[PDB]
Amino acid sequence: RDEGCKLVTIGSGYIFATTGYGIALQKGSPWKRQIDLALLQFVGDGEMEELETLWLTGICHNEKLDIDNMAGVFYMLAAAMALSLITFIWEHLF
Amino acid sequence: RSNGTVSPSAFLEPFSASVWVMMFVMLLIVSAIAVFVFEYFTIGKAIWLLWGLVFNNSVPVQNPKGTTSKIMVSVWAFFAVIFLASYTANLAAFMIQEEFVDQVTGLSDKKFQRPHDYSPPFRFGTVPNGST
Amino acid sequence: RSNGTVSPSAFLEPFSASVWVMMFVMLLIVSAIAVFVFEYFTIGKAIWLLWGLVFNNSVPVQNPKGTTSKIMVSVWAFFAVIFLASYTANLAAFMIQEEFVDQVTGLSDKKFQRPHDYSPPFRFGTVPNGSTERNIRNNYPYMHQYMTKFNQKGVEDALVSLKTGKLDAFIYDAAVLNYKAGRDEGCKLVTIGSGYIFATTGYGIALQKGSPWKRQIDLALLQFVGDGEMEELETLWLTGICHNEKLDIDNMAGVFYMLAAAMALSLITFIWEHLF
Amino acid sequence: ICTGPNDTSPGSPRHTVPQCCYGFCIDLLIKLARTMNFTYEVHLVADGKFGTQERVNNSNKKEWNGMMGELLSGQADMIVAPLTINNERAQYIEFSKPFKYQGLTILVKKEIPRSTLDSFMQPFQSTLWLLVGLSVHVVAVMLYLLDRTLSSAMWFSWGVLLNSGIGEGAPRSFSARILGMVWAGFAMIIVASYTANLAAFLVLDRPEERITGINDPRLRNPSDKFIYATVKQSSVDIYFRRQVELSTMYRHMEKHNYESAAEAIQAVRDNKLHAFIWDSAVLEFEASQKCDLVTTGELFFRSGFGIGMRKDSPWKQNVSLSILKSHENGFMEDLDKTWVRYQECLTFENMAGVFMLVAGGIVAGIFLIFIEIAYKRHK
Amino acid sequence: ICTGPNDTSPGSPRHTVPQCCYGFCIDLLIKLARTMNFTYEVHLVADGKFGTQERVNNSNKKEWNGMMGELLSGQADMIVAPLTINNERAQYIEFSKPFKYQGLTILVKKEIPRSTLDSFMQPFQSTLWLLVGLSVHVVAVMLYLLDRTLSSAMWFSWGVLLNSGIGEGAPRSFSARILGMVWAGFAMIIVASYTANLAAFLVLDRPEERITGINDPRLRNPSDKFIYATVKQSSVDIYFRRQVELSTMYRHMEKHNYESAAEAIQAVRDNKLHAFIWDSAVLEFEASQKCDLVTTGELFFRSGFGIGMRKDSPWKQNVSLSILKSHENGFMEDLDKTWVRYQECLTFENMAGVFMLVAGGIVAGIFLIFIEIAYKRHK
Secondary structure, three states, rough: OOOOOOOOOOOOOOOOOOOOOOOOOOOOOOOHHHHHHHHHHHHHHHHHHHHHHHHHOOOOOOOOHHHHHHHHHHHHHHHHHHHHHHHHHHHOOO | OOOOOOOOOOOOOOOOHHOOOOHHHHHHHHHHHHHHHHOOOOHHHHHHHHHHHHHOOOOOOEEEEEEHHHHHHHHHHHHHHHHHHHHHHHHHHOOOOOOOOOOOOOOOOHHOOOOOOOOOOOOOOOOOOOOO | OOOOOOOOOOHOOOOOHHHHHHHHHHHHHHHHHHHHHOOOOHHHHHHHHHHHHHHHHOOOOOOOOHHHHHHHHHHHHHHHHHHHHHHHHHHHHEEEEEEOOOOOOOOOOOOHOOOHHOOOOOOOEEEOOHHHHHHHHOOOHHHHHOOOOOOOOHHHHHHHHHHHOOOOOOOOOHHHHHHHHHOOOOOOOOOOOOOOOOOOOOOOOOOOOOOOOOHHHHHHHHHHHOOHHHHHHHHOOOOOOOOOOOOOOOHHHHHHHHHHHHHHHHHHHHHHHHHO | OOOOOOOOOOOOOOOOEOOOOOOOHHHHHHHHHHHHOOOOOOOOOOOOOOOOOOOOOOOOOEOOOOHHHHOOOOOOHHHHHHHHHHHHHHHHHHOOOOOOOHHHHEEEEEOOOEEEEEOOOOOOOOHHHHOOOOOOHHHHHHHOOOOOOOHHHHHHHHHHHHOOOOOOOOOOHHHHHHHHHHHHHHHHHHHHHHHHHHHHHHHHHOOOOOOOOOOOOOOOOOOOOOOOOOOOOOOOHHHHOOOHHHHHOOOOHHOOOOOOHHHHHHHHHHOOOOOOOOHHHHHHHHHOOOOOEEOOOOOOOOOEEOOOOOOOOOHHHHHHHHHHHHOOOOOOHHHHHHHHOOOOOOOHHHHHHHHHHHHHHHHHHHHHHHHHHHHHHOO | OOOOOOOOOOOOOOOOOOOOOHHHHHHHHHHHHHOOOOOOOOOOOOOOOOOOOOOOOOOOOOEEEEHHHHHHHHOOOOOOOOOOOOHHHOOOOOOOOOOOOOOOOOEOOOOOOOOOOOOOOOOHHHHHHHHHHHHHHHHHHHHHHHOOOOHHHHHHHHHOOOOOOOOOOOOOOHHHHHHHHHHHHHHHHHHHHHHHHHHHHOOOOOOOOOOOOOOOOOOOOOOOOOOOOOOOOHHHHHHHHHOOOHHHHHHHHOOOOOOHHHHHHHHHOOOOOOOEEHHHHHHHHHHHOOEEEOOOOEEEEEEOOOEEEEEOOOHHHHHHHHHHHHHHHHHHHHHHHHHHHHOOOOHHHHHHHHHHHHHHHHOOOOOOOHHHHHHHHOO
């Protein structure tokens, strides 16, 4: 969601060390099993995808006469002219 | 990276790697065949006519003689025109592509690995008091 | 359509209008200027040279010769090159575009009002004991009486017969037909009217005569429509597979006829010149 | 003969000047009066608002304002107008079977089509035009570099790239001929690439990015580029307040609504606003008639129109049955045909921006010939 | 030293012959064993399945199978292998923190050929070429008839229409000159149309579109032309069966489910299949090494792998801590670089296809020249 889609993350998400987010809890609280089961069920039943598409979906994320060719053709023309001059010089010498 | 777009073009892509050599050698073979056919400045005239027919008809000469030579020249001109049309179509289709450069992946680079020296003063912006 | 339909539109080009006269008079003025500059027999040769330069440089003419002549020849060649490049780009853009026309686009058409004396008799696809057939019978009787000949059992059989070519036209409910066309096999069948309906009346939930549910049901249905659930439900249940996702020999017929007409005109002109 | 206020501004000498009114609703009313048996006293609304719930000023209660308030008062009777069906409207009064179907159909002023090859340097890089202007001369110089008729050779080299084929320039050196052929091939490749680039630019000539639908992220995200318009805050504000997710995107339109239906259209065509949300029929007819603007988007909130009634009047059943009969009789489609079904609705710049250059060259040819003659006479 | 069987084909004499196993998961197991000071006796699974649960024969009491069944029935103690985390599994097996992150993905053979470059004017019409040649011959014949040098004019016209520029044409009447100019314009228009058709075919490169994920209706609606299935016993079937929106695809795939990944890939090799839904890492590697197939489509149901063990086991917290510590300090990245991601992979047909034809002329003209040699002798 940048302004004009100017700045870019280097590479195709080359995450150095993937860890992941997550809810916290108290040490050995009785809420661990139920919370984990509910979170896994939510992940499985295509709801997190809807939430992700609704909340943090951007705009540029969907989006994604050359002078170099002119320079190359100029280089080729210069090389051809140099070769022609060399051939003329060789003809004159012989 | 908005400072410099650096959009890739056809010049960056390889040109005349090996197909151009084949094109040149079969052009020379066809020119030699046409010269031999016309045999039974003439060689230079035939070379100029073949080069013009390949490139553009703005180089006329009295190289081909007889009905067979005229037919061969016309066939070569038609082949060159078809090749030029195909080349134009390919060039038009090429413009729908624009790649990107990634190069460095992760922190495995001397810009990041080497803190000091280098030449331009870099930066490693990272807010404190976090996991990073 | 029985098969793929494409319109070459040979006569749809912007030529044969004030623009063509404009370019013709501009070329004539340029030719006159060229003749005057060269003169500072050759007029016809110069006209042929310019006509070739517009068409193809394979027409050798030696009428003009000069430095200013070379400059104007270069300018004319550049103009012709730009014009031909623009024309090729425009033709490519038109080829990218499409022009599809409707078949009948009307229920009370000439065909479906007295089809006996017009081509082989057409077909009126429907099924009796419905709601569309009753309307057809009530509005005009002759079309219904002719429709009594052609009648399938259901809908899928009628669609199969249509695909096999057994029948010609199908008339039935708009929503069901739209759903069938949206999710057809290969998207080979499309309704004649592009989003065209004739007797728009919605569906309904038939209560009993005076039941104590009408107010609550109507209010709940209006609330459902307003709150937006109907949009998602229609997207889930009623959406087509493709639906929204979307040197010919015949193309040269008109230009060949124009060439033949020009040939006849040239022959007439040659005969007239020979007479004089 | 309408009998309604003419002072449309809020606060004026309200004049009950008789007026002249006609159209779709009037024709339907005449048909209903012929089918049924009654007489009409058509009179225009006083305020102009369609009608919405609002809190009474300097109080805490709420009352029906706008045209609906007249229905909830003595006037009432058989309100016929481009009304719309909604839950709040149907809670108090009762409607009939719909006599039309319409959506919302986002309206935006059409972008001006300027991509017509008016300027040759517009698609490609203009500097490239210069980058080839002098280089050819250098190539010719290279040919002259093989010399060890100058004007004729220069003209021949200048014309070969344009397929002139003069044949008047032929240096004796064979290497010069080879270099000339190489340059001709290079020019052919360059012009082929230029034509391909022009064709690609023409094919991909689609700078328009008009927002489609209400769920488009460009339209979903608020900004200050352009400004919306919900038109008079009636029959659409109810929908926007009903949808809380839309209520998040309500404020921008909330503080920028207009107070009528055509004034905002005039502002839009005056390049002051670029957005609109109204009934499908009005916007579509306006776009068809005024061949300047078009409607882009997909229909949403498809709620049909409907004639109005009060409480539970004896006229309801017969009126609804007559409307259904008119729908099934083909009368309504025929009436729509005669009232709203028809209202008016080589690039030109390509041939215009280049013929001027040809005319200028033709004009300057005589001057160049005179200059050459004078130069020859001087020496 | 793995201790698995070699009787994967049913009915074979299972003997539990010792075998070898040296995968990346084995490297992780070695590191874990070294850190924690225990010892291991790894052995393969009997049947081979990721443990998708099912019902026993004619009895409504659920029971497991495969790896999960072997672990749960007091036979094994740790399940270190790709065991993608689910909800039905996690009800009673204590998983660990994931050591990978992958999601389901399609797999389809990539169309190797996309162009031929040796095609004649067949794509538009060969009959179009025939009629164009007939019209050219007819207009030439009429031009030579109205002259009242037919061979010279014919050669000149052929050269002009083939851009040879012979220049041997000498029209006698201005009407013939105008007809020739019109014919040259028509030939230019025909060339423009041919180039337009060529560009239309070129821009349409790769007409076969790519199926993207599962939301695409062209895949959601089944057909007898398309066939795909993942495996008859895995977590993909559990994921599909759990949620009920595309049961038609469920039955379609259940009619053709496979047994193992290798068999499905081999079936794809000879085009017995057309699509394959499987884990991201396996398909990505398979595309990386033998890059004949492709990894198109998006990814869905994101859930990493893990190491499973019973609810009460004294290794749980320590195993999770060790996995997280290695993941953070970067030992896992080295393994990823070493094992999974390590490898990477107009023509002459446009010329030779006509060049040999040119040779045919060299084998045809000369004899005709001999006939021409006779032609002078005959006359």
